Structures are given as structure tokens and as C-alpha cells.
Amino acid sequence: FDSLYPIAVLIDELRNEDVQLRLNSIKKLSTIALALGVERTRSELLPFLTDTIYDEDEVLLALAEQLGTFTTLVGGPEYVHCLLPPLESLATVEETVVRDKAVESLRAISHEHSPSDLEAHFVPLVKRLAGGDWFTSRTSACGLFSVCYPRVSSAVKAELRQYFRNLCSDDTPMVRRAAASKLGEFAKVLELDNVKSEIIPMFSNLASDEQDSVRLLAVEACVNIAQLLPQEDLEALVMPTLRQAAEDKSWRVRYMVADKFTELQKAVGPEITKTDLVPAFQNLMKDCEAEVRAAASHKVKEFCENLSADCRENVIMSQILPCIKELVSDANQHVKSALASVIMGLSPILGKDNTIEHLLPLFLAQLKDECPEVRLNIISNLDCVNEVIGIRQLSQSLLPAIVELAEDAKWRVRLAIIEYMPLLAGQLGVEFFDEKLNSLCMAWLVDHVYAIREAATSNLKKLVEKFGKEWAHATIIPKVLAMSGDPNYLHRMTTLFCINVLSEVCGQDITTKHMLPTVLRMAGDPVANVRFNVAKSLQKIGPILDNSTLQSEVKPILEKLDVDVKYFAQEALTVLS
Amino acid sequence: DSLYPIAVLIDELRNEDVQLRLNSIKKLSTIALALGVERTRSELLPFLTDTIYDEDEVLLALAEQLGTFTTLVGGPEYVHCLLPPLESLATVEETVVRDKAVESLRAISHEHSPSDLEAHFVPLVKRLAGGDWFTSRTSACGLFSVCYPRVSSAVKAELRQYFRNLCSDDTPMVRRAAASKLGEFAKVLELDNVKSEIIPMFSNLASDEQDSVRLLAVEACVNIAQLLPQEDLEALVMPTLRQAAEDKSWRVRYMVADKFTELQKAVGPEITKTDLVPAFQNLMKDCEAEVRAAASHKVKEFCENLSADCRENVIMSQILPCIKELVSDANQHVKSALASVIMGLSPILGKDNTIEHLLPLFLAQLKDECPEVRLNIISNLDCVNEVIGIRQLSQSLLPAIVELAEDAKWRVRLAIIEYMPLLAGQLGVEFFDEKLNSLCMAWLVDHVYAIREAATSNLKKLVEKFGKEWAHATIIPKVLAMSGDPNYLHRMTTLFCINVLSEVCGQDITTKHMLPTVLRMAGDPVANVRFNVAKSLQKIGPILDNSTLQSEVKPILEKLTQDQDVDVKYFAQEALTVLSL
Amino acid sequence: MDWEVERAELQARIAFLQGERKGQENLKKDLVRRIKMLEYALKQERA
Amino acid sequence: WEVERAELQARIAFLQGERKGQENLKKDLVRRIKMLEYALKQERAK
């Protein structure tokens, strides 16, 4: 009926107070266009959507998205050129994501213009946007240049090139930033003669601008331009601009070159890399700002293996290793951890002998670093050098560092290494332990600071949780049982504490046979505090069923049952039975 | 893909939420409209016929939907494709699903070409008529009157005999359906078949072995009588109707009583005089009370449709003593049903005959112990008023109104105050002012309080009917002199009357004649009257104006606020709170 | 206290659900209209 | 006396049930919309 004319339906859906019910109306605009057909979609729907709509961000974004898909619903590509006016309105609005969704939709329906009508209606749109009063139109136009250039006549290719040149010399920094970003995207559709003629001058002009925001985005496009030029003329044009960009007084630009450095290297090949690009890497690692240093440090391994193999090793040793030697003792806890993440991969690149002579002092230095990220990032990449050096040659060279910061004066340091002991035992392996470590874990148990002893009993628990009840029974359990029964009565208590936490991982048979007889022998000891914790200890074991021997536990438990001892024993016997 | 209008429907029917499947069936037109017309007939309707099972509401929605599908299957030329599934739904056990399927069948019957009627519809009627389970036969009964008129004579005969076999079915459950559709079917039959086959089935079903079928046949009798020409009515209908009027189920005698005026103005006045009048008398003396209730309930209109020549005679000779003994009936619904209509016999008997014979019955009806008999006698008073004049009417009302107003009892005096306004609205004000206002005053000084409240609120109604100035004339002088009374209860009653009259008489009347009196009572010795003066001033206040209020009311409420009586203080300040501050 | 703080939470829940409820209801209102709109359009296309 | 704590609970349960029902009803409604869309596209072609 008259109230079902899809235009009237859309109208009465648009007078809603709620925005979610207008959003869900515009999100299903496909249905309105499909119900109107293709004759009335052009006759009345697109005129409606072009001028009339003034609503919030959320709605206009969906409208741009919908106009992006209306090609079939409008009559096919012979009539696609009428989706342009409303998307043009949307390409100038104040909210930025709506502008960019409209530009994305315009580039999408660009491919649907046949060159004949592409020249006719789609290019005058890009012109109008590039010449608009307020700059939002001009940023949108910057988005629209790359898509339509290639399939258009040569004269209008020249005209578009001129309009883009005009946009790069714009007054407002916002337009200049936009064009600087789209510079590479435009260069990809230009003929090589025009890339040298027109693109490289605009490139050098933007990279030598007053604002840093644009210089930043022109050195970004530098990697696309360098990939479009042959290595020979590449040196003359691109390298002045690049070298002055690496020495720019704004750390943002130097950060951008450090970031896109592993890509710039592959772009300019391995010759110019060896010549001018490696020293720029060196003074970027010696940069005055820390956040540039970290970005450069992340790019060391990606840079080293991507070198000319003949000169790669000589240059790595002479030119890059001293800078690491000083970067390991940097001041910022982020540069250090960033280089710690990737410095391990330099080991298959240098060989076993060179790694031992020149890389092992650096990894051992960054192992003793106080920052937890540096230590963890070093340990996380230990297989990288484990396969290059060998488990023996590796364990034998870090053991001194483990024992160094194991007997370090600061209790914080000793706790820091007890923390990382089990994951550093994940890559050292079941073997290549024992030696003087096990001894380190026991010396941990006799420590003065209580936090160290607590973390070390809870460390033995996880350290048999990774090797096995068999391993624990073979090497740890004897050292533990040996401590029960000794002059300093506190060590007996710590023996029983670790026995308590140890029974939580071994099956009944191994826990029973060897932990009960010496817990009861050391339980016969005169001191009341040792027996007191004996009772508390047999309480927590209990739970590991012992049933047949549980009773044999209840009878000596009654025998022991000085007031504190009795409290603990009675509470244990009540809870167990 | 999975957007196929049948796959969609299967998935819709698989959902567990019953309301979801219901909303699926309710909008089944959308599915067929998607399918089109070729695929609708070919694919959808077989899927609906053989295999569709659900709760009764869904089945009923489907039966509803199928009635409108005529266009969605190809116009009339193909409407018969709707017949299979509906027949399934006409055999369901649930009564409302069956009845809606029958509804849709009768609806799409008229969208059949007579050729299609014989081809597909009538065979379905025969199928349903000969079903093993009674639901089929009950459903079949309703389908006869729609297909008979446009089908050949031979099929007319077949239909007639199938219907005959339904009226003689062994189940009362379908004999009842046949008796229901009997008149609806006789209205489409040729006159010689209603004399030939309808009348015998009417006589057989009207004397069946079940009360239900008998009452249903005597229901479908009023249609039968209006199809024969008068003389034939007598020989045929009257033996059956006579037999019904003495049926042994009181429900059937009630049926005869309730349809009575329709039977007299269908059967013709002559044979009403011959037979309905004596049967009417025998129905007014009926053992079961509800029959007497319906018979008395239909007295005025029965006598209004009698033969114009003998009305008076017959009314006086045989009808009136039955009403004279129905006035003294035992049941209270019989008494009240009579009282609602005994009025309409005054315009029929004319002034003199109404005065002599109807006035005794009317007064005796007014003397009944009921809030329903008395109320019904006074509610409808204008028809007898304009027949017997206002004077001669009130000539025989005061010696009854006064007898109840000043009655020894307690409930009786209150009982007649409720209907004092409407007795006075109609029936003249000039009547009211002479004798009937002394009773409305004496009400207010009654020992019991309930009567006094009734009269005080009565006053408002009387000023609603008669006007502001009538109240100024007769009520206010007698209400203010009540204030002068040694008993303080009556002094209080003056305040209550003044505030119920303060919402009707406007600012002028209330300010001049009632505010001076209300303010004088503020001085009263008894504390009750004083705090009630404060309450009454609070009630009057709103209708007053500010200048008189702040000048005369506020100072007196202030003087009451210091009273060394806690109640006077409370109510004087509640007044001052609502009014002054 | 402890029992009256929970009641305010419950009231807040019922408030939120009520707001959402209305929208969803009058969203279905539009949806049915759209099916009607399509029904009518299909009805015209057959002619 | 805090029986209101149980009736408010019943209200919340009812509202959550209705929210569930209406949402998965909207699902079927959208399906019908797509069904009609498809029927219209096919009828539009031929």
C-alpha cells in the first residue's frame, strides 16, 4: 500500500528516537534498494541519501559501507557512476572514520567504472575533492589518486599527476601528511620515467619539510620508492634523502628509519647496505634517544643474517659487535631487553668458535642483569645457542654465572635466580645438573633469609615436577634426608618442610618408604619445636593415602601425644581419623 | 540454498519454543507467496496434509490460514487443492481445531465452481459424514448448507439423505450437531423438502432420548416456523412445539419460554391465541423456578404482540391472574424478573384498566423484601407515569412510600432512601415539595446513624436533580434550623449537610447562607461540634474565595487552634495547613 | 547494609533489561514491516 | 518480610527469558526476509 513504498518505509524507520534502530535500518539498506529495483534505486533512493542524511558517526559509517556494495543493486556497472554524489558528500564529513570508509568504498567501486565513464564521472570527483575549500576533501582525494590512474588515458594521467603534485605543496600539514602517506601507493601506478621525474622530487620535498609528522611519513614511503628504482640510479636520488633522514633532529623520523630498517636493507640491496647503511645503523644504535635505540636493537638479528655473506662476518665482528658490547650495559631497561630478545640468534650466524670467543661474554653479562625481562628473554632463546655450541660447552660456561649470582650478597638476586631455576632447567636438560647445582639448591635451603628457603623448598617441588619421581628418588631425596639430624636444629625443621612439599608429587610408594622412617627418627629428637613441626608435617602427608601404614602412623602419633606439640598432634590425629 | 521456502519452514517447525512455531504458521502466507503458485500447490500443501503434528493452537492457526489461501494457489480454478489438509484438521479430536477447519471449509466453499463443488467438495462431505469416529460426522454436519444451493438435483438428493443418516446417528454427540444445523439447512431447502424431510427430522430430534438434542431441535424450530406458510405451520410445527412445552427436562421448557415472543411473531397471531396462551399459562405455573423466571421475564413484549382485537379481553381473562399469583411467587428471581417488565402493561391496558388492576400488583411489588424487586419496581416508572398521570400515580405512592419511610424496622427505612433521588428525578419536583420532603428531613434526625448518613448524601443527589435554587428554598432553611438543636448530634448533622451541600451550590450560596452558620457553631459548648466545625471549614475552604477566606475563615481557625482539647487543635491545624498556610 | 545493597543491584538490573527490552520489541516491529514490504514488492513483480 | 527479594528475582528471570525468546525470534524474522529477497531476485531475473 502507500505505506509500503520502500522510500516511505525507510523514512518512517528514520524518524526513530533510538540510534540503534536507524543503524539497523541503514545496515539493511541492501533490502530497500533491492525492493525498489534498479530503476527506482536511481530515481529516488540515491537522491534521497545524497543530500538529506545528517546523523551521528555510527550511521554515516554504515551508509558509506552500504554505498560500497550497491553496484549490482543500482543497475550494474553501466550505471555505477551514480553512487558517486552521496559518497562524495560522505568523503568530506568532519568525522574521520566515515571519511575513510567512504574513500575505501570509492576505491572499491572505482574498478566498476569502465575507462570511458571513469574519465567522465569518477575523475572529476577526485578533482573536486582535491580542490575543496576545507582540507578533509583533500585528504580523501589523496586516497583516491592511486586507484584510478592506471586505466585512464595518458593526458589525464598527466593531469592527475599535476593535481597530486599540487596536494604535496599544500598549505595545511594535514593534507601534506595524507599525500606523504599515499606517495608510495601512487608511485606504484606510475611509469618509471614519471617515478624519477615527478615522484622522487616530491619525496625529497616531503622528507625535507618543516613539520616532522610529514618527514616521518615520507621516509615511510621511501621503502616503496626504493623498490621501484634500479640499484644504480637508486644511489643518486634516494640516498641523499635517506642519509639526511637518518640524521634528522626529530627522534620520530630516526625512529621510523630504525623501524623500517630491516626493510630498507632488502629494498636497496646488499651493496648500498654495506656502503652507507651499516654506519647509519651504528650511530642509530648510539642514538641520543632511548626509544630509537630499542627499535634499532630489535633489528640486529634480522639485519645480520641479511648481509652479504662474504663481508657479513667481517663487518659483523668489526662494526656491530662493539656496539652490542656497549649496548649490553645500556641504561634503559628496554633497550637491554629488546637486544636480549634477539641477540641469541647471532650465534648460528657466527659459528661455535666465534660465539665462544665473542658472544658468550655478552650473553653471560645479560644473564646476570637485574631486569627480569633481560634474564627471561636470554633464557627463552637458549636453544638458539644450545644447538650451535653444545650442551656441555654451554652448561660449563654458564654454570659460573649461575653460581655467581647464586652466592651474590643481595637476597633479591638469589631469589631472582631461584625463580628462574626450573625454566633454566627446562633447556639445560635432565642431565648437566647434579655437579655443583644440586649443591646450589641445598645451599639455598640453608640460607638465612626466610624468603629464599621458602622459595627453594617450593623450588624442589617444581624441580622434581619436571624430571620425575625416579630422578627425585635418585639424586634429591638423599640430600634432603641427610639434612634431618644435624647440630643446628633449624635445618631439621627445614628438612621436614621440604619433605612435606615434596610428598605432593611422588606416588605413595616412593614417599612412604624413604620419607617416613627418617621423619620418625628425626621425630624422636629431644627438641620440642622439631617434633611440633613433625606432627604438623605428618598431618599434611596423611592425605596421600597410606591406609595400611596410615594406622601405623596413628600409633607413633599417639605415642608422641610441650603443650604446642600436643596441640599440633591432637589436631592432626583428629583431622586424619 | 537453505533459503528455500520449504527448508525454511522445516527449520521453523523444528524449534522448541511453541510460540515460535505458532508465529511460523500464523505467517504461512509468506512461505507460499515465496513459493509462488505452481510450487505452492505442488510442494507445500502435500507437506501440510500428510505429515504435520503439533499442539492444538498451532493446528488451529493452520486451519485459520488455509481459509485465505484461495489466491495463493491460483484463484478459484484451483481452490480445491486446499481440501486434503483441511479434512485432516476436520478429523482432529480437539473441538476448536475441527470447528476452525469447518469454518475455513465453509469459507472456501463459495470460491468453488459448481463443477469443482461436485468434483471435490461434495465427496469430501460424504467422506466426513461416513467416518468411523464421530468427529468426522460432527464436522460433516456443518458443511451441508454451503454446497447444496449450487449443485445438481441428484447431488441435492444425495446430500439430503446423508443428512438424514446423520440426524438418526447412534451417537448423541452428532445428533446434536444435526439438530444445531437443522434450521441452517432447512433455510436452503425447497419448500417441499422442508415439508418432506426437514419436518420429520425436526419431530424425531425434538423427541430424542437426550435433553440436549431436544433443546437443540426446539432451538432450530424458530427458523423452521418461518419457512412454511401459516396453515402448514399448524399441522407440522405445533404438535412438536406443544410437546416441547411440556418436556421433562426443565431446560427444554426454559428453551420454549425464552424463544416465546419469537415464536408468537413467527407462528402468527391466530394460533398464538389458540395454543401459546394456554401453554404460556402452564409455563407461568411451572414447577422449576427458572422456567417461571423466563416466562415472567417475557410478559410485556408477549402481550404487545398479541392480536390487537382481543388484547384487553385475553389479558384480563387469562394472563392477569397468572401475574397476580406470580407477584406472590416464592423465588426472588421470579419476583424481580416480573418486576422489571410489569410496568410495560400500562400503555397496553390504558389508564383505567391499569389503575384498577395494575396498581395493586405494583404496590405489592414495592412491598417486597428485596433490594432487587423494589429497585426494579421504581427504576422503570415513566411508562406508567405518562399513562396514569402524575397525580393519580403519586396518589398511590405516598401511602406506600410513607409506610416504608416511617416503618418500625431498621433495614426497611434505609432500604427506601437509596432510591429516593431517582424516585424524585422523574415523577416531578412539585410532587416532591409537598409531602415527600418532610420524609427527607425526618431522615436526618433518626436514632440510627446509617439512615442519617444516607439522608445527608441523599441531599447532594437531590440538589443535582432539582437545582441550586430549589436547595436554597427548601433545604437550607431546614438545615440551618437543625443547628439550633439541644442534642449535639443534630448540630453535627447540620455541619455534615452543609459540607455535602458545599460542593453543589457554588460560591455564592455557600458563602452567604452557610458560612455565617458554620462560624456560629464554632462557639458551641460540645467539643465534638467544635472540631467538626474545623473539619467542615477545611472541606468548604476550597470552593470559597481568598478574600472572604482570609478575612473570616482564617481568624476563626486560629481561635480554634488554642482550645485545650487535643482533637480540636489537631483538626483546626490540619484545616489551616490545607487552607491558609 | 548487606540485604538492601543487593536490592539496589537487582533494581538496576531490571532497569537495564527494561530499556533493552523496549528497543528489541520495536525492532521486530520494523522487521515484520520489511517482510510486508517485500511481500508487496513480490506481489507487484508477478503482475 | 523481604519477600520482595524473591519477586524481584522472578521478574529478572522473566525478563531474561523474554530477551532470549525475542532474540531467537528475530533470527527467524531475518531468515524470512532473506527468503523473500531470494524469491524476489529470482522472479526479477525471469
Side-chain angles (χ1 to χ4, degrees), chain A residues 1-434 436-509 511-520 523-530 532-535 537-539 541-543 545-546 551-552 554 556 564-565 567 569 572-573 577, chain B residues 1-511 513-553 555-581, chain C residues 1-2 4-47, chain D:
Chain A
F1 177 28
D2 169 84
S3 71
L4 280 67
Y5 194 48
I7 303 289
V9 177
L10 186 58
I11 290 184
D12 204 274
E13 301 176 344
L14 286 189
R15 38 195 60 258
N16 193 306
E17 298 79 324
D18 195 331
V19 77
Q20 290 291 116
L21 270 162
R22 286 175 280 105
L23 190 148
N24 254 273
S25 172
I26 297 303
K27 267 185 175 169
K28 319 283 183 201
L29 200 48
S30 158
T31 305
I32 298 282
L34 192 149
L36 292 158
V38 301
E39 64 256 13
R40 291 177 291 182
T41 288
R42 297 180 272 104
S43 279
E44 302 152 75
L45 189 67
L46 290 184
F48 183 92
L49 283 51
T50 300
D51 43 8
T52 57
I53 300 301
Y54 300 113
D55 207 312
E56 202 67 17
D57 305 346
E58 231 34 60
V59 163
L60 299 186
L61 177 147
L63 173 57
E65 256 202 20
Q66 226 55 27
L67 287 178
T69 198
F70 267 21
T71 325
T72 293
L73 294 191
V74 86
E78 198 191 351
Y79 298 96
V80 63
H81 63 81
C82 60
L83 284 183
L84 290 177
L87 273 174
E88 167 177 4
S89 272
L90 277 43
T92 80
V93 302
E94 181 182 324
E95 182 60 7
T96 308
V97 312
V98 173
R99 253 198 327 280
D100 194 8
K101 208 51 152 195
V103 170
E104 177 183 78
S105 285
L106 268 54
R107 300 173 46 156
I109 74 178
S110 152
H111 300 359
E112 296 290 339
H113 293 77
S114 62
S116 78
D117 42 322
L118 196 149
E119 307 197 34
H121 310 277
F122 188 92
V123 165
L125 162 70
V126 184
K127 273 184 180 113
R128 285 190 299 278
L129 289 184
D133 290 312
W134 183 251
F135 67 100
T136 61
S137 322
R138 298 188 260 122
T139 73
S140 292
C142 290
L144 289 181
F145 272 98
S146 160
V147 68
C148 79
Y149 182 94
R151 338 197 316 259
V152 87
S153 83
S154 308
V156 285
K157 286 177 180 164
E159 302 180 26
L160 275 37
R161 288 186 299 98
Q162 157 168 78
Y163 263 102
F164 191 85
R165 197 172 55 251
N166 283 359
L167 286 185
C168 291
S169 66
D170 196 292
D171 300 315
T172 41
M174 294 70 183
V175 181
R176 285 191 280 107
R177 289 196 227 113
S181 70
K182 301 324 195 66
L183 190 48
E185 198 189 305
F186 199 49
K188 297 287 254 182
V189 306
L190 254 57
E191 318 80 359
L192 184 61
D193 292 330
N194 268 343
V195 166
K196 299 189 284 184
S197 317
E198 309 253 17
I199 291 290
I200 210 76
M202 284 175 317
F203 169 67
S204 57
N205 276 117
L206 297 170
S208 304
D209 188 88
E210 44 177 334
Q211 318 284 348
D212 65 329
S213 41
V214 288
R215 285 178 268 129
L216 176 65
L217 276 169
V219 316
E220 177 155 21
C222 181
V223 81
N224 286 95
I225 290 160
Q227 280 168 346
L228 290 195
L229 292 173
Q231 299 172 17
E232 293 77 26
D233 61 358
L234 181 64
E235 204 292 327
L237 322 172
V238 180
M239 292 301 105
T241 301
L242 192 55
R243 288 193 280 266
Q244 75 179 7
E247 309 180 25
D248 193 339
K249 55 186 187 306
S250 173
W251 65 276
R252 303 181 189 274
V253 176
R254 287 182 271 110
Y255 185 94
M256 187 59 79
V257 299
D259 196 16
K260 305 301 212 73
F261 206 81
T262 202
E263 303 178 342
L264 228 37
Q265 180 190 30
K266 222 158 82 173
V268 309
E271 176 80 1
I272 311 94
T273 288
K274 196 185 320 177
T275 298
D276 58 14
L277 198 75
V278 159
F281 190 60
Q282 292 179 313
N283 51 11
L284 271 192
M285 295 192 286
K286 289 168 167 56
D287 195 286
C288 65
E289 295 301 306
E291 40 277 356
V292 166
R293 268 179 295 164
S297 291
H298 262 297
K299 299 304 181 169
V300 298
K301 187 193 78 201
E302 297 292 302
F303 186 74
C304 285
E305 44 198 4
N306 295 0
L307 289 176
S308 171
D310 56 6
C311 294
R312 163 184 153 169
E313 185 177 358
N314 194 29
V315 149
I316 281 188
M317 290 290 169
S318 318
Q319 289 289 274
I320 299 183
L321 203 51
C323 297
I324 316 298
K325 244 182 301 175
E326 187 187 354
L327 267 186
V328 295
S329 51
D330 197 67
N332 197 305
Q333 81 244 59
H334 288 276
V335 171
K336 280 190 278 199
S337 47
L339 170 65
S341 67
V342 301
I343 190 185
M344 283 291 162
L346 253 68
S347 184
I349 298 172
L350 295 178
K352 179 182 206 146
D353 286 327
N354 279 274
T355 281
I356 282 167
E357 178 157 319
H358 300 280
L359 251 54
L360 263 173
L362 271 60
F363 302 157
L364 272 38
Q366 290 196 170
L367 191 58
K368 284 116 66 173
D369 200 292
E370 283 150 339
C371 185
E373 207 178 359
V374 181
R375 219 183 300 114
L376 179 49
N377 279 353
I378 284 319
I379 304 186
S380 298
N381 290 44
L382 265 185
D383 53 356
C384 288
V385 74
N386 182 25
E387 290 163 341
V388 177
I389 287 298
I391 303 255
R392 257 266 293 283
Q393 186 66 233
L394 178 68
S395 69
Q396 181 178 329
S397 76
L398 58 60
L399 172 94
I402 301 299
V403 309
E404 182 192 320
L405 50 65
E407 306 170 343
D408 198 327
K410 306 185 178 59
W411 65 279
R412 308 252 187 189
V413 169
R414 293 177 274 113
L415 182 43
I417 190 56
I418 276 89
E419 181 166 5
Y420 286 151
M421 187 67 77
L423 58 89
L424 182 274
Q427 310 175 317
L428 216 58
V430 187
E431 314 85 0
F432 297 100
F433 225 77
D434 289 345
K436 184 185 193 301
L437 308 217
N438 285 185
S439 296
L440 270 189
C441 297
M442 303 296 118
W444 293 140
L445 288 192
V446 308
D447 200 6
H448 287 306
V449 192
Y450 176 68
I452 293 293
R453 279 176 303 152
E454 180 172 16
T457 59
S458 185
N459 177 68
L460 295 194
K461 173 183 61 203
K462 40 191 56 183
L463 211 63
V464 320
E465 202 162 309
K466 193 179 290 296
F467 291 169
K469 342 178 172 185
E470 286 76 35
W471 175 83
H473 200 332
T475 177
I476 276 202
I477 300 276
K479 286 220 186 78
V480 167
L481 300 195
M483 200 163 68
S484 87
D486 56 348
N488 199 288
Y489 86 96
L490 270 158
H491 297 163
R492 307 186 185 108
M493 294 172 54
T494 59
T495 298
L496 270 74
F497 283 127
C498 58
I499 281 188
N500 307 344
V501 73
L502 207 40
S503 69
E504 290 174 68
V505 288
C506 332
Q508 178 256 345
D509 37 356
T511 49
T512 299
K513 291 262 176 182
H514 306 69
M515 294 177 182
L516 285 189
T518 311
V519 167
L520 307 186
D525 85 305
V527 179
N529 298 88
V530 184
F532 175 78
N533 276 121
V534 162
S537 86
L538 274 71
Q539 175 180 358
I541 288 198
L545 294 51
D546 290 84
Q551 178 56 29
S552 290
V554 166
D564 51 357
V565 168
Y567 183 16
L573 264 169
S577 312
Chain B
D1 309 282
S2 66
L3 308 192
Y4 187 64
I6 288 294
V8 163
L9 192 93
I10 308 174
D11 215 47
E12 275 185 357
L13 298 202
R14 291 190 184 274
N15 291 339
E16 175 50 43
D17 194 2
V18 180
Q19 288 288 322
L20 262 167
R21 305 177 254 151
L22 189 68
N23 195 253
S24 308
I25 297 308
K26 276 171 162 186
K27 268 288 199 169
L28 190 55
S29 69
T30 310
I31 287 285
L33 194 142
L35 278 179
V37 170
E38 268 87 10
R39 306 199 165 260
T40 298
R41 299 184 274 242
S42 61
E43 300 203 55
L44 186 147
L45 277 75
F47 168 71
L48 294 194
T49 309
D50 305 314
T51 69
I52 195 156
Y53 305 109
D54 216 293
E55 312 187 7
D56 297 348
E57 284 266 338
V58 174
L59 269 44
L60 175 126
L62 176 62
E64 286 203 24
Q65 208 74 5
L66 290 187
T68 48
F69 266 48
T70 300
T71 288
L72 289 88
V73 293
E77 189 184 354
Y78 292 84
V79 59
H80 53 84
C81 313
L82 273 39
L83 283 168
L86 280 178
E87 184 178 347
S88 274
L89 278 38
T91 60
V92 193
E93 66 290 345
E94 179 49 41
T95 308
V96 277
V97 171
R98 281 200 328 269
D99 268 348
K100 203 60 182 187
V102 167
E103 165 87 304
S104 299
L105 280 174
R106 305 180 54 158
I108 61 179
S109 152
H110 315 101
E111 285 298 298
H112 275 304
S113 46
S115 162
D116 282 328
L117 248 185
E118 306 206 6
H120 311 113
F121 192 95
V122 177
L124 174 144
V125 189
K126 303 177 205 156
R127 267 191 299 278
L128 287 182
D132 316 308
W133 187 253
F134 67 82
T135 54
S136 307
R137 294 118 95 183
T138 50
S139 288
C141 292
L143 293 173
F144 277 92
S145 45
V146 304
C147 59
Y148 196 88
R150 314 139 55 203
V151 72
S152 84
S153 301
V155 188
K156 281 193 189 75
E158 306 179 46
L159 279 181
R160 280 185 263 107
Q161 100 163 325
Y162 266 103
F163 191 93
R164 252 174 39 214
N165 292 339
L166 287 171
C167 297
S168 64
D169 195 284
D170 308 311
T171 52
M173 313 175 275
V174 332
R175 281 187 257 127
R176 275 195 318 262
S180 320
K181 310 297 175 182
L182 195 48
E184 165 185 330
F185 181 62
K187 289 192 174 171
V188 78
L189 243 60
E190 312 85 347
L191 178 59
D192 298 294
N193 277 320
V194 48
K195 289 212 306 177
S196 150
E197 290 178 353
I198 287 288
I199 267 307
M201 301 182 289
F202 167 57
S203 278
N204 288 321
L205 272 154
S207 41
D208 199 6
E209 279 286 335
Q210 183 167 108
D211 312 1
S212 306
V213 275
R214 291 193 264 99
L215 55 79
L216 272 163
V218 303
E219 185 224 16
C221 164
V222 196
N223 316 273
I224 299 314
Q226 287 165 339
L227 298 177
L228 304 320
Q230 179 172 3
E231 22 284 315
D232 306 345
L233 279 68
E234 186 285 323
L236 311 177
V237 187
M238 289 298 106
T240 294
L241 191 151
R242 277 194 269 270
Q243 185 170 122
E246 283 140 347
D247 199 78
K248 300 157 194 51
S249 178
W250 66 270
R251 309 187 162 280
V252 179
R253 294 186 300 283
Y254 182 87
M255 187 61 199
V256 177
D258 184 76
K259 289 292 201 154
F260 208 86
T261 64
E262 298 301 321
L263 295 176
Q264 66 162 162
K265 65 174 166 277
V267 166
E270 305 294 326
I271 171 154
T272 74
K273 270 193 58 185
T274 74
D275 278 309
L276 275 49
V277 165
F280 193 73
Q281 306 167 199
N282 294 134
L283 283 185
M284 301 186 111
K285 302 139 49 189
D286 200 74
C287 52
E288 184 97 5
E290 319 197 12
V291 177
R292 291 175 294 188
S296 49
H297 211 308
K298 302 186 67 69
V299 172
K300 153 195 154 47
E301 50 169 341
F302 168 71
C303 312
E304 179 181 319
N305 305 352
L306 302 179
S307 67
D309 50 15
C310 213
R311 278 173 159 173
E312 290 182 347
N313 200 6
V314 295
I315 283 292
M316 311 291 289
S317 306
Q318 293 157 358
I319 295 193
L320 182 56
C322 277
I323 312 182
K324 178 202 62 181
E325 284 194 7
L326 251 57
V327 79
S328 310
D329 201 90
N331 194 307
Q332 74 178 17
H333 275 48
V334 175
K335 282 178 184 242
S336 68
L338 171 58
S340 72
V341 290
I342 184 65
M343 293 288 169
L345 272 63
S346 30
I348 296 297
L349 285 174
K351 182 176 184 178
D352 307 331
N353 295 322
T354 77
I355 301 294
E356 179 164 8
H357 301 75
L358 287 171
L359 273 199
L361 276 67
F362 276 127
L363 293 191
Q365 283 268 275
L366 182 64
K367 296 293 182 299
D368 191 75
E369 333 301 320
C370 285
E372 279 310 303
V373 182
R374 229 179 317 184
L375 161 76
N376 270 262
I377 283 304
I378 281 202
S379 312
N380 298 316
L381 259 170
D382 58 355
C383 49
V384 65
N385 180 18
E386 56 212 37
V387 168
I388 81 172
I390 170 97
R391 167 203 297 174
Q392 182 44 235
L393 179 50
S394 62
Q395 170 71 42
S396 290
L397 240 56
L398 292 174
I401 295 307
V402 180
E403 186 208 281
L404 299 186
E406 316 159 23
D407 201 280
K409 312 287 184 54
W410 168 89
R411 61 175 285 183
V412 176
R413 296 187 277 116
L414 188 68
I416 84 167
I417 306 185
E418 324 287 325
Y419 57 68
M420 185 64 49
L422 81 95
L423 178 53
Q426 67 192 13
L427 192 122
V429 48
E430 293 84 2
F431 173 38
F432 206 59
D433 277 352
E434 273 319 312
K435 183 52 209 294
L436 252 199
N437 187 267
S438 166
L439 308 178
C440 271
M441 283 313 108
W443 286 148
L444 296 160
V445 291
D446 211 309
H447 318 281
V448 38
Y449 150 81
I451 298 187
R452 277 187 280 114
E453 153 154 79
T456 55
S457 299
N458 199 74
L459 270 212
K460 175 186 173 205
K461 270 53 188 161
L462 270 41
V463 193
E464 288 178 348
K465 266 73 180 187
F466 286 4
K468 215 170 301 181
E469 303 173 325
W470 172 83
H472 187 336
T474 60
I475 293 177
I476 292 190
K478 273 176 168 180
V479 151
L480 302 191
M482 182 169 294
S483 89
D485 203 276
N487 200 333
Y488 74 103
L489 293 173
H490 303 162
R491 293 198 268 83
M492 277 166 113
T493 292
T494 296
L495 277 170
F496 300 133
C497 290
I498 290 181
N499 38 77
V500 298
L501 296 170
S502 70
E503 36 193 78
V504 178
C505 302
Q507 166 154 227
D508 177 18
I509 298 309
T510 298
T511 294
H513 291 70
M514 299 193 295
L515 208 52
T517 309
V518 153
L519 297 187
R520 243 135 51 173
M521 292 177 72
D524 193 329
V526 194
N528 293 67
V529 187
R530 291 185 279 123
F531 91 86
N532 262 127
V533 165
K535 276 177 96 175
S536 169
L537 275 156
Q538 170 181 353
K539 175 134 190 61
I540 280 172
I543 74 107
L544 279 192
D545 58 339
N546 202 259
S547 80
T548 61
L549 193 149
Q550 286 272 1
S551 60
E552 333 220 3
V553 173
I556 298 309
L557 282 183
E558 298 187 332
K559 198 47 189 171
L560 267 64
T561 39
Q562 31 201 50
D563 196 77
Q564 34 213 1
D565 187 11
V566 284
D567 293 347
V568 178
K569 284 177 178 221
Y570 177 104
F571 279 104
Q573 183 164 0
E574 164 174 313
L576 272 185
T577 286
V578 181
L579 284 195
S580 160
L581 306 101
Chain C
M1 337 182 194
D2 191 321
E4 284 54 41
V5 146
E6 177 187 347
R7 175 183 67 193
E9 289 189 350
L10 265 49
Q11 291 198 329
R13 188 89 157 91
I14 296 183
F16 163 69
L17 287 184
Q18 268 280 132
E20 201 181 57
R21 205 231 294 188
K22 203 198 163 170
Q24 297 237 56
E25 180 72 33
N26 83 315
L27 166 62
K28 142 174 81 78
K29 289 195 64 57
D30 287 2
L31 271 195
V32 185
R33 175 163 50 183
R34 265 186 144 83
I35 92 173
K36 294 197 41 201
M37 171 186 72
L38 288 167
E39 269 187 86
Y40 183 70
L42 194 48
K43 285 175 53 187
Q44 81 192 188
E45 188 84 355
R46 273 142 173 64
Chain D
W1 193 221
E2 198 183 342
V3 162
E4 178 188 348
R5 173 183 180 273
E7 47 199 17
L8 264 50
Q9 288 194 329
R11 186 86 48 94
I12 295 183
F14 161 69
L15 285 183
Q16 276 175 173
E18 205 184 13
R19 203 191 52 174
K20 199 196 75 186
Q22 62 189 7
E23 180 130 87
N24 85 316
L25 165 63
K26 141 176 82 181
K27 289 224 318 165
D28 288 2
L29 239 47
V30 184
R31 177 164 50 184
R32 264 188 144 84
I33 291 239
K34 292 202 203 83
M35 171 188 73
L36 288 167
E37 269 187 38
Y38 185 69
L40 189 47
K41 284 180 280 185
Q42 288 188 129
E43 191 85 355
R44 281 194 181 295
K46 266 174 176 178

